[PDB]
Amino acid sequence: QLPYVLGSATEGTFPPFPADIYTIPQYGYCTLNYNNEAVDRSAFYCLDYFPSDMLRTGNNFEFTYTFEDVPFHSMFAHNQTLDRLMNPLVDQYLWAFS
Amino acid sequence: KETSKRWNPEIQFTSNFGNAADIQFAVSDTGSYSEPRPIGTRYLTKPL
Amino acid sequence: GNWHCDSQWLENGVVTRTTRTWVLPSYNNHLYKRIQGPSGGDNNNKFFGFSTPWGYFDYNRFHCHFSPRDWQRLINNNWGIRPKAMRFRLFNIQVKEVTVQDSNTTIANNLTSTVQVFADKDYQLPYVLGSATEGTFPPFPADIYTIPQYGYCTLNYNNEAVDRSAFYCLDYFPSDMLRTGNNFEFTYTFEDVPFHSMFAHNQTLDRLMNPLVDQYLWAFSSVSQAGSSGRALHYSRATKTNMAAQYRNWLPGPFFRDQQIFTGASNITKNNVFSVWEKGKQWELDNRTNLMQPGPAAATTFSGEPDRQAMQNTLAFSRTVYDQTTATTDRNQILITNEDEIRPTNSVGIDAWGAVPTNNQSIVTPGTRAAVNNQGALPGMVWQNRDIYLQGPIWAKIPDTDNHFHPSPLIGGFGCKHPPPQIFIKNTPVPANPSETFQTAKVASFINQYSTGQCTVEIFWELKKETSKRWNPEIQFTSNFGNAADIQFAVSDTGSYSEPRPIGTRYLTKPL
Amino acid sequence: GNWHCDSQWLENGVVTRTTRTWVLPSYNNHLYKRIQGPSGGDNNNKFFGFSTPWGYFDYNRFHCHFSPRDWQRLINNNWGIRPKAMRFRLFNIQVKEVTVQDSNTTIANNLTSTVQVFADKDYQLPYVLGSATEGTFPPFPADIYTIPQYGYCTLNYNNEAVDRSAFYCLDYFPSDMLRTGNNFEFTYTFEDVPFHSMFAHNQTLDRLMNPLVDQYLWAFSSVSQAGSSGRALHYSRATKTNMAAQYRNWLPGPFFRDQQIFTGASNITKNNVFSVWEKGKQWELDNRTNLMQPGPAAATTFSGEPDRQAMQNTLAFSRTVYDQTTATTDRNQILITNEDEIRPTNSVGIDAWGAVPTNNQSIVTPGTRAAVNNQGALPGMVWQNRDIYLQGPIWAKIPDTDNHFHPSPLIGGFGCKHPPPQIFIKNTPVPANPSETFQTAKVASFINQYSTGQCTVEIFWELKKETSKRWNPEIQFTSNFGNAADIQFAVSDTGSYSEPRPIGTRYLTKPL
Amino acid sequence: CKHPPPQIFIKNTPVPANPSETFQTAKVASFINQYSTGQCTVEIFWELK
Amino acid sequence: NNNWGIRPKAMRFRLFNIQVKEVTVQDSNTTIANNLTSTVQVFADKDY
Fold first, then answer.
1. Which residue intervals of F1-48 are DSSP H helices?
2. How far is C212 from chain A (nearest CA, A)?
3. Å between B1 CA and nearest CA of chain C
4. Nearest to D300 by CA among D352, D345, D260, D253
5. DSSP string, D75-136
6. CB spacing of C201 vs D172 below 8 angstroms
7. Are D128 and C209 in contact (CB under 8 A)?
C-alpha cells in the first residue's frame, strides 16, 4: 500500500562483503505530477499511519515470506541455433515459390 | 472494496460543479430524462 | 506497546487508533501557585484560580483521531456518528535528567525516577476540557505533543476570592507512579448520546406540503370596507399557488439574532466601522458581560447571497496548530466554516425570526407589529445542531445542574454528564542534595528533569450508514477544486503539515 | 374482501373500520414532470419540485374513520384517545380501458392489466401527508374517493434548483403489481404517542389555591415615603381577599401574540381595514416570510366577550368536502372552531403574555416596564394542545432533525417519528401498437385507462374512560340547538352530504 | 512478482529535548541527536534444477 | 467512490405479465383488444 521503490536498481543495497557495514538508505517516493508541480491525483503517504513494532535493545523483529510461483531462470545457453533445428542430412518435402 | 491508507483525501464524483439552477440526472418539465455528463469508474487512485 | 495510528472500518462502526509522542515539563517548579486575572478596570476578564504542577492529556478534537482520508470516507458514506467506547494507554515512559553547565546542556536518563498519573473518573476536579483550547494532540502523527499545564478557575469577585471558592490539591488523589518499564491504561465507555446528523436536508421546513393540491383549511384573510361605515371579513383557503399563507405543523428552532458583515471582495466596502464587543450579541452573568460566541446555531447567510453573512455564529480554525499569531486581518490565513447546511430548518441569523402583533386593533387604532429578534422555545419547534468539523471539539461536559435544555454543546460535538475523564500526569520531584545538617527551610532545589513517552488513544465510533434511494447523485467531499499545483493536507518542503480548508460532516442529504 | 364501514366499541378502546371506492387516473401521461412555482416578483410563493405519475391514499382526517354518532359516543364518554395499530388493505381491483371515437366514449375492462402499489415504510420519500390538504377520503361512505396525484418540493432558491435538491423516482422502489383477482394489504402499529386530552379544566391555572385560607409567604409590596427624604419598604402576605399578588408554582405555556378581529354583528364595524399578511403574525425562514397560521395554541377570546377573538389561531372547515370556492366573505358557509376550552391553562391570544421591568430604578429614574408579546418556554410552564376535531388531521410526521420541542403538530393530532406510511399507487402503462419497424423515438402513445376498487382502513384506538365524581351533570355534545326543521349531518334532497358545525373532543372537564 | 518481498521500513523514534517549563504552542524542533545500529539476517530458500 | 474493482458474477432474467393486443383499424380509427389465448414464444440461445 506504499510506493514500492525496490524494483528500480539503486544504491543502498547490502554490501557484497560480509565484514562491511550497511548504511540504511532514506525512503522517499515520487507521485503523479505535471513537471515539478503536483497534479490533482498525487498522493501523500505518512508512514506513521501504519502500525509498527517499537523495539528496544532486548527486542527483535522477524517475519517470514513465501514467493509466489515464478518461472525458473534459465541458467543454461543453447547448443543449437533457432534456424538450424533441422536435420542436416535430409531435404524438406515442402515446395515453395522460388 | 477500497482500502486506502494515503493520508490526504481523494477525488470523488460529486454533483457540484455545473449550473446550480440545473438539476442533473432528473426529468425536465416535458418529462424527458437526460444524462448531463458522462461518468466513468476511475476516480480513486492506487500506487502503481 | 506498539505504534497504532491506523483506523479499521467495521460494519456499523469504526475504531480510530492514534499514537503520539509527548513531552512533560515540570511546571511551576513543583508548586501550586495562585493565579489571578489581569489588573485593569475591565471586570469582564478578571478571574481567580490556581495553577498546578500537573499536566493533562487533551485529545479532544476530531483531526487527532481521524486522518483527512478517514474523515472523507466517514462523511461521504454515513448519515450519523457517535462515540461508544474509548481506551487510553500510556507506555514507553522515559524521564530525562537535564544538567546545564558552562552554557552547555547535558541530558541523561534516570531509570528509577517515576511519573505519576491518574484519571479523574468521579469528575471531582474542575473539568477544563469542554472549552476548546490549545494543547490538543497534533493532527499529524509525526508531530510531538507538549502536554499542557493544568490550572482552573474558582468562584470569584473580580480577581479576589469569594468565600465559596475552593482549592483542589491533585496530590490528594490516588495516583499510579510509573517508571520506564511501567505503563498506564484505562478504558471508558460513553453514555448514550444521540447520533450526530451527518446529512443535510432535501426539503425546506415550510415546503413539506404537496405542491399539487390545496389545503382544506380556511383561515381569516383580510378585513375590507363594505359600504361606507361597514366592514367585511374575508376568509380563504391556502392554494398551491399561495404557499406563504398556509397551515403548517412546525416552526423553526429557537433563535437569537446576530449582526451582519460583508465578507467578500466587492461587498467589503459596505461594512460600517464597528467592533463585535459593541454591535454584537452577548449574554451577561453576574457583573460580567460575555460575548455569545457560537450561540444557538443558525444559517450563516441567505441563499444566493454568499458574501453577506453572520459575524457571530460561524466557527473558524487555523490551518496549522502551531501559529503564534492571535489576531489577523487576512482570511486566507485561517479557515472559516459555513453553516448553510442547516438553512432548511434553522432560520438565518441575519434576519429576524418573525413578527408579533403589539396591540389590539380598532377603528381608532391601526394594528402595530414588531420584529422578533430573539425567540425562546415554542411548541412545535425543530432545529439542527451545528455540525462537527474535522478540526473541532469532539465533546464537552454537561454541567452538573438541576436543569438542562437540549444540552448539545454550542460549539459542537457530544454533550455528556460523564464525559471522558481528565487524565493528569506529573513528574515526581527528586530533590537536590540536602545540607547535611538539619534545616527547617522549605526544599526549593530539585533535580531538573522532564519525561517523555508514547500515548495511544483508541475510540470505537458507531456509524449509521447511508441508504439513499434518490435517483440522481449527491454532493460528496472531493479534493478537486483549488490550486492543482497545490497538494492539500500534506507537508511542505520545510516539513510543516497544514490543513488547507475546513471539513464538516454534512454533505449527504435526506428528506426532511 | 367485504364492506366494513362499522366501528365496534371495546373495553378501553375502539376500532374504526371504513371502506371507500376509489378511482385512479393516469397522471402526467405516465411521466415524471418538473413543476415549479408561479412566475412573479413575490419570492414567498416560489418552489421547485417534481410531479409523479403516481397517486397516494390520504385517509388522514377524523371524519373519514368516525361517523358523527361514533364521534359523539367517543367524546362524551372518554377523557383521552390515541391510535394503537392500523390495517390498510386494498381489493376488488378492476381497470377500465377507455376509447373515445366519434365524440362517443366506450369503457371496457382489461382483466390482465396491472396496478402496482407500495407503501413507503422506511420514510425515504418526501412525506406530504402532514400538511393538511385535499384528496382525503370523503366523510360519507357512499361517496367515491379520487386518489390525488403525488408530487413533492425539494430544496430551492426561488423557482430554480439549488445544488442539494433531489429527484426521487418512485419506480426505483419495489412494488406489488396487482390484477383484478389480486389484493394488497399491510399492517402498521403506532409508536407510543401521548393520549389526546378530550377533557377541559374545572379550575383556572391561577385559582388552584384554597380560597378559605391565606398564604404564609411574605413578599415585597411597595416602597413608601417615610418622612421627607426617607423611604420605607412594605411587605405583605397574600390573603384570600387578594389573590392577584400571591405565590404560585406554575405559569402559562409559551405564547405568541396575535391580532384581534371583531367577529360579530354589532362589533363587525369596529374592525380597521387591513389584511393578515400585514398586521398578522409570521415567521420567516431563509428569504421567505410565512404566516404563522395555527401557531402555539392560545385561548381565542376572553370570557364574556365571545365576539372579539383572535384572527390567527382558530381553525376553520368547509361544511362539504367538494366546495370549489377558495375565498368567501360569509361565515355561514364555513365552520369556525372555538379554542376557548384551553383558556384556564393557555393565556388568550389577544392580550399580552405579561410585563417585564425594563430598567433599574432609582430616585433619579422611575422604573419602566414593557409588555411581553412573545414568550419562550420558562421553567414552570404548563399548557394544552389544540384539540382535535372531527374534520381535522389525525397525525403529522415529526421532521427528522436533531432537536424537537414538545413536538405535537400545531394544527392538531398526533406527531410521530414513524407515522403511518405513505401508500403509493399507479396504473402500469400499456403502450399502443408500435410502428412494425424499429424506431428509436420515445413511446408517447399508451392505452388510455384508469383503475378503480375498494380500500378498507382499520384503526384500533386506545381510550381512557371517564371517571367523574363531580356531583352535578356535565356539558355533552347534543344535536339539539339549531334549526329544528334542519336535520344535521344528513344528506340533502339533491344527495349532498354536509357537516353543519365543527365538533371537537373537549367537553368533559377534569380538575386542573 | 505481483507480491514481491515486502518493503521493510525502519525509523528512530524521536526523543525531544527539554521543553520550556512554560507551555508554548510552537512546534518541537529540538530532538536528542541519536542513531541506532544492529544486525539483520536474511535467509532465502532457493529452488534449483 | 467506494470500490477498487467490479466484475459480474451471476445473472437472472425473467419475463412476466405477458399480454398480447389485437389491433383492428377501420374507418381511420384504431381499436386495440386483448387476446388471452394467443402466445408469444421465447428462447435464450445458450449454446451460442
1. none
2. 46
3. 11
4. D260
5. HHHEEEEEEEEEEEEEEEEEEEEEEEETTEEEEEEESS--EEEEEESS--S---SSS-BS-B
6. no
7. yes
Q: Positive or negative, the Cα torsion across C238, C241, C245, C250?
A: positive
Instruction: Cell 460561524: give the residue.
Output: C314
C406: number of Cβ within 10 Å: 15
Q: Is A26 exposed, middle or buried (0-12, 13-18, 19+ CB in 10 A)?
A: exposed
Residues C233, C223 contacting (CB under 8 angstroms)? yes
Which residues, 6+ apart, have CB-to-CB distance to A93 below 8 Å? none
Per-residue DSSP letter, D349: S
**Nearest chain F residue (CA) to D108:** F33
Cell of C157: 469577585
Backbone angles phi, psi at D359, to 5 degrees: -155, 165
Kindly report the number of other CB atoms within 10 A of residue C334's CB atom.
15
* C3 DSSP 8-state letter: B
Rounded Cα gap, residues C235 and C47, in angstroms: 61
Q: Give the amino acid at C348.
A: V
For A18-67, give the DSSP string: TTS--PPPPP-----EETTEEPTT-----GGGS-B----SS--------P
User: What cell was used for D313?
Assistant: 389561531
Chain B contact present for A56, CB below 8 A: no
Q: How far is A2 from chain C (nearest CA, A)?
A: 14
The owner of cell 372518554 is D78
Q: Residue with C-alpha cell 399557488?
A: C241
Does B2 contact chain D (CB < 8 Å)? no
The per-residue DSSP string of C206-243 comes to: GG-S-TTS-BS-EEEEEEE--TTT--EEEEEE--TT--
Q: Hey, which residues does C187 pair with through a beta bridge?
A: C87
Residues of C in contact with A55 (CB under 8 A): none
Q: Kind of pairing, strands D144-146 and D13-24?
A: parallel
Residue E16 forms contact with C (CB below 8 Å): yes
Using an 8 Å Cβ cutoff, are D270 and D400 in contact? no
Q: Nearest 5°: phi and psi at C429?
A: -75, 140
- Identify which of B22, B26, B31 has the shortest CB distance to residue D31: B31
Q: What is the dihedral of CA C17, C22, C24, C25, to 10 degrees?
A: -150
**Three-class SS string for D389-402?**
ECCCCCEEECCCCC
Helix (H) or strand (E) holding D356: strand D354-357
Which chain C residue shows the shortest CA-CA distance from D311? C220
Cell triple for C396? 464537552
CA C335/CA B27 separation, integer angstroms: 38
Please tell me the distance in Å from B14's CA to the nearest CA on chain D: 11
Q: Which residue has the cell 370570557?
A: D303
Tell me if E19 and C321 make a contact (CB, 8 A cut-off): no
Query: Which value in Å is the resolution of this experimental model?
Result: 2.5
Name the region of F28 (left: φ>0; alpha: ψ -120 to 50; beta: rest).
left
Q: Which approach determined this entry?
A: cryo-EM
Give the C-alpha separation, A4 to D432, whole Å.
Answer: 63
Beta bridge partners of D509: D200
Whether the CB-CB separation of C20 and C144 falls below 8 Å is answered with yes
The residues near E16 (Cβ < 8 Å, ≥ 6 apart) are: C21, C23, C144, C452, E28, E30, E31, E32
Closest CA to C135 of C25, C34, C37: C25
Contact call for residues C210 and D148 (beta carbons, < 8 A): yes
Q: Are C282 and C274 in contact (CB under 8 A)?
A: no
Rounded Cα distance between D393 and D395, Å, is: 6
E5 contacts A5? CB cut-off 8 A:
no
Sheet holding C48-56, edge to edge: C149-154, C48-56, C422-427, C115-120, C176-178
